[PDB]
């Protein structure tokens, strides 16, 4: 998990659904 | 994008069963290996360490990951989120370092026909936590207000206090890939190749080479998925969501057969050595 910013609602959702790694 | 960023129902149906099966097989296999070891030389100590760290890796990886499919909400605490990735990375580190130590030991067994093994195992178990420490201070739950739900993502925060943590998070995927795939795989392959050259019998050579190939093949997809997410994710292409969706698919598959590599070590001992064959036999 790593996102450029906390304003785009796509990366954060992806890390919500991703695995813990 | 359109917003089809979701996990397929068929994917959940297959993956729950597959993950449960590999989890149970791993726990029974590694527990039996540890019990047999308990009931004494450097190879035995290293195999015991590999089995113990393997059990830790499965019990810290499979349960929460398979919980992430049914609920995908993370109702746990902030400290648990801050801690679990650290333990997972430590387990991976000790696993790969134990594989490295085992390869070196098997080379020296045929090339140069326990205190040193203990001082080389304490070094492994401290180096792993030393290198996994940065993971423990990065993860943090943040509740982002999605357009329709109140998320609780436990992620690596893009904005954090320490500057070194930002510098590391810049290339976390690269460093992880390097240290946990390239170094152990390359060192194991080099040591086993020199070992086989010194010996030449062929059964042991094919055994060690097949073990190395199995390790590489079963550990590649996680690093591949992380690298793809790092380098192939863009900002102004409508396909991004689909790619991300596909990433999730690949990512989960990795973790599954990542644990498969975990359980390949006990089976490899059952299929090769007569002593362990008899040990597991009854």
Author numbering:
A (entry chain L): 1 to 21
B (entry chain R): 90 to 128, 133 to 206, 215 to 301, 318 to 399
Quote the passages of the study that discuss this structure, keeping the authors' original sentences.
Endothelin type B receptor (ETBR) plays a crucial role in regulating blood pressure and humoral homeostasis, making it an important therapeutic target for related diseases. ETBR activation by the endogenous peptide hormones endothelin (ET)−1–3 stimulates several signaling pathways, including Gs, Gi/o, Gq/11, G12/13, and β-arrestin. In this study, we present the cryo-EM structure of the ETBR–Gi complex, complemented by MD simulations and functional studies. These investigations reveal an unusual movement of TM7 to the intracellular side during ETBR activation and the essential roles of the diverse NPxxL motif in stabilizing the active conformation of ETBR and organizing the assembly of the binding pocket for the α5 helix of Gi protein.
Furthermore, we performed focused 3D refinement to obtain receptor densities at a resolution of 3.6 Å. Receptor density was assessed in the ETBR–DNGi1 complex after adjusting the alignment center to the receptor. Compared with the ET-1 bound ETBR model in ETBR–DNGi1, the small RMSD values of the Cα atoms and the similar residue conformations in the other two models indicate they are nearly identical (0.391 Å for ETBR–wild-type Gi1 and 0.364 Å for the focused 3D refinement of ETBR). The mode of ET-1 binding in the ETBR–Gi complex closely resembled that of the crystal structure of ET-1-bound ETBR. Y13ET-1 and F14ET-1 in the helical region of ET-1 played a pivotal role in the compact assembly of the N-terminal tail and the extracellular side of TM7, initiating helical rearrangements of ETBR. The C-terminal region of ET-1 (L17ET-1–W21ET-1) fits into the transmembrane orthosteric pocket of the receptor, interacting with many hydrophobic (I1572.60, L2775.42, L3396.51, etc.) and hydrophilic (including K1823.33, K2735.38, R3436.55, D3687.35, etc.) residues. The C-terminal side chain of W21ET-1 directly interacted with W3366.48 in the CWxP motif. Interactions between ET-1 and ETBR, both in the transmembrane region surrounding the C-terminal region of ET-1 and close to the extracellular side, played a role in ETBR activation. These ligand–receptor interactions influenced the helical rearrangement of ETBR through the conserved V1893.40P2855.50F3326.44 motif, resulting in an inward rotation of R1993.50 and Y2935.58, an outward movement of the cytoplasmic side of TM6, and crevice formation on the cytoplasmic side of the receptor to accommodate Gαi. A simultaneous downward displacement (~ 1.5 Å) at the NPxxL motif (N3827.49, P3837.50, and L3867.53 in ETBR instead of Y7.53) was observed in the ET-1–ETBR–Gi complex. N3827.49 extended toward R1993.50, and L3867.53 formed a hydrophobic interaction with I1402.43 to stabilize the helical contacts between TM2 and TM7.
